[PDB]
Each structure stands twice: as C-alpha cells, then as structure tokens.
Design a protein around this ligand. Structure first.
Ligand SMILES: CN1C[C@H](Nc2nc3cc[nH]c3c(=O)n2C)C[C@H](c2ccccc2)C1
Ligand SMILES: CN1C[C@H](Nc2nc3cc[nH]c3c(=O)n2C)C[C@H](c2ccccc2)C1
Lengths: 211, 211
C-alpha cells in the first residue's frame, strides 16, 4: 500500500510513543494486518513505531464544527515551560460559559480548557471513542460522562470557600481559589499546591457527599 | 496463597498504573499466572490492577548500601509544586562530585539527582533490569550505559557556553546556564525554555560530535 484514505506515505503526522506523549514524525509505511491496517511512523525525535489508526493523529488543527462531545483528540498540555502532546476526549465545545473553549478530559484524568489551535484529531478513533482509554477508572468516568452527557452534575463553589479535596486516597484541607467554567482551581493548604479540578469530580467533598 | 517472600497480603505497596505513574495501595491478592506470580493491588486513590513483580515497589526507602548502578527504582519527580512517582534506573550513587545524590535515568528518558528519601525499590526487577523499559531508545541507551558502566563518556561544559541542543528532531541555538554534576541546564534561546540534560546525551552537539 501507499494510500489508505488520506493517509499517504511521506506525510507529516503525530504518533503516540510508549511513554504516552505524542510526537511529530513521518508516515513511512502502511501495513496490512488482517482485517485492517497499521501505520509505521518514524519520529522526528528518533524512534520508530508501528501504530494502529487510533494512535496517530493529523498534523493540523480540526475545524471546531467537526468536534463534538466524545471526540478523540490530542491536546497541548503546558507543564510550565515544556509543552507536551497528550490524548483525551472533548468534554465541552465552545460556548459563552466556557469563553469559547474546549474542555478536554485527558487519558490520565487531568482536565483543562484549550482552544481549537491546541487540538489535533486522531486519525481513526474507535466507534466508542473511550474504549482505547487504558486507565480503567478514567475510561469508566468518560463512558458515564458521554452516555449521560447533557446531564452533568456539578457542585457550586465560590472563591474563598473552604472544602476538603481528595488526593491519593487522603482528604486534605483546601480552599477554592478561582472558578473557570466547569473547573475550579483548588489550593491545598498543607503544601500550598494548586490544581484545577472538574466541578463534577467526586474528589471535591461537596460533590462526594451529594452522591 | 497469601505469601511470596516478604510480599504478604494486606501489606502496603506501590503499584504502577497504566498511565506510568505509581501510586500507593494495598496488596490484596497473589495469583499464579503461567510460570510466575502476579500481584493484585487496590490503589488508595481508586482502581485495582493485577501487576507483575517488576510493576510493584515497596513502601519504604531502600538502604543506600543496597543500591547499585543498574538498580530498578521508583523515584519522586517534582514539577515544582506537584510530586509524581515514576520508574527509572540508578545511574550514579552518591559521591563527592555529585554532592552525595543518586542520579536517576527515568523510563521516559529524563534524568535527575535525588536523595535516598526520594527512592523506592522495585520488588521483583528483571535479571537484566532495563529489559522492562518500554521506550526502546531509552532501553538501548540504558543497556549500553549499565553494561559499559564505570566508563561514563560525557562532555565538559562551562556556564555561558553556546552550543546547539537537539529537541524534537531540531537542533536549537542554546546556552549552558548551569552545571550540576553529570547534568547541565540548557537554555533554549528561540523560545527561552530551560531543561536539565545528562552530559553524556547526544542531544548535546559536542557529545553528538564526539569521536
Ligand atoms: C495530561 N497529563 C497531565 C499530567 N499532569 C497532571 N495530571 C493530573 C491528574 C489529576 N490531577 C492532575 C494534575 O494536577 N496535573 C498537573 C502530566 C502528564 C504528563 C505526562 C507525560 C509527560 C508530561 C506530562 C500529562
Ligand atoms: C519522569 N518523567 C519526567 C517528565 N518530564 C520531563 N521529561 C523529559 C525527557 C527529556 N526531557 C524532559 C523534561 O524536561 N521533562 C520535564 C514528566 C513525566 C510525568 C509523567 C506523568 C505525570 C507527570 C510527569 C515524568
């Protein structure tokens, strides 16, 4: 083979490394594997991988109209000075409440608002898009979320409010610093760490109790 | 069965999640699979996994006089405020030149110096400790390094030195800001990012060019 749909050897493409971050390279071969095909990527950053269609993504930003709740995407994550690419699911499309942004639920349970220009469409997602989410607890939340979807139980929080927030099986004293749409920035008082958290997460005590 | 050496059911343990970070939990079972045992971990946070012995670690910091170049460990990784647990290989043990710290080569190719109180020992490492490193470029680097060991080819670098440093397939104009033992802090100029890098890495042009 040399083409499969719009996947064509020598094209630029994004590929998921075994580390779970995604990296730019070139599609150097396509390979038939039984019923379907696999896609061989040579990474700009030196390695090579033979990948299924749901572990590559196009090197362009999608049009924010083909994005729906449940869409499989790769999104930029800004860990301070570095920027990484990581997979997730579109949880919210742009609107007035979220200030015309996309809410992304990443495959490791993190959540963040991003713009169309920080997103890449996965080439061949699965029919049920959450089924290649490796972490089972995250996969299950996504499946419940997308299935209930328009239903989205959240907790009302106000800046300064004192609550307990879960982290690593412990409940910690914390304070609400800020609310941005469906997220809340939480300050943990013991170690002064901050963390953005979906307002429907049971890690927030008022959400834990409501349930 | 409920015992295997000092792996005993109801003990506290660290287990490796499918996201590649490690989390505290409880050993709730031991299961025979093929020729060996797997270990069922219920995580403090949420979730359960049936893990092989090299994907669990003890809850305590190891006796410094038990750690060697090649030891398979879990180390604390500090993103400023956040702390994660991530698997790696001891590349150096404490000495005068490294300010009595352990140098850790993590499984995703990062390197940092840590103290004994930031380490946890993997319960059942492979005979060749690198053989469960998933990223093949990192694996091959660590095999060569551990196999070559007291041989430690590095480049010498001075504060202020201008060099090219690789990042994602591109060589960027950069500067040596700091030397700390076997690591150097590089300032990428085009976009101002700082990054710690092992002085034996071929991402440093002088090393890439060493012959
Ligand atoms: C998306 N994902 C975000 C992770 N960061 C994060 N995950 C959770 C989950 C709950 N809370 C937090 C939280 O606060 N943070 C900061 C870091 C991760 C990463 C993987 C590999 C290389 C660099 C980065 C990428
Ligand atoms: C050890 N590993 C380090 C990664 N960070 C990193 N890796 C490389 C590789 C070359 N250069 C850098 C570099 O500069 N950084 C900052 C982040 C990663 C992580 C995974 C999941 C959740 C939070 C964190 C842990």
């Amino acid at each position: 083979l040399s083409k499969d749909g719009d996947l064509i050897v020598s094209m630029r493409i994004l590929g998921k490394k075994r580390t779970k971050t995604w990296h730019k390279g070139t599609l150097i071969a396509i390979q038939t594997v039984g019923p379907g095909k696999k896609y061989k990527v040579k990474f700009d950053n030196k390695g090579k991988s033979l990948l299924s269609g749901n572990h590559i993504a196009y090197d362009y930003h999608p049009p924010a109209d083909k994005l729906y709740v449940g869409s499989r995407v790769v999104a930029k994550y800004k860990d301070g000075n570095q920027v990484w690419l990581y997979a997730g699911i579109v949880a919210e499309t742009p609107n007035v409440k979220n200030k015309l942004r996309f809410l992304i639920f990443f495959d490791d349970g993190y959540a963040s608002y991003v713009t169309q220009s920080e997103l890449y469409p996965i080439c061949r997602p699965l029919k049920k898009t959450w089924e290649d989410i490796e972490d089972i607890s995250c996969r299950d939340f996504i499946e419940e979320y997308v299935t209930a979807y328009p239903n989205r139980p959240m907790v009302l929080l106000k800046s300064g409010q004192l609550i307990k927030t879960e982290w690593e099986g412990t409940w910690w004293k914390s304070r609400v610093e800020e609310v941005d749409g469906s997220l809340v920035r939480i300050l943990f008082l013991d170690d002064k760490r901050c963390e953005w958290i979906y307002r429907g997460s049971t890690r927030l005590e008022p959400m834990f109790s409501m349930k």
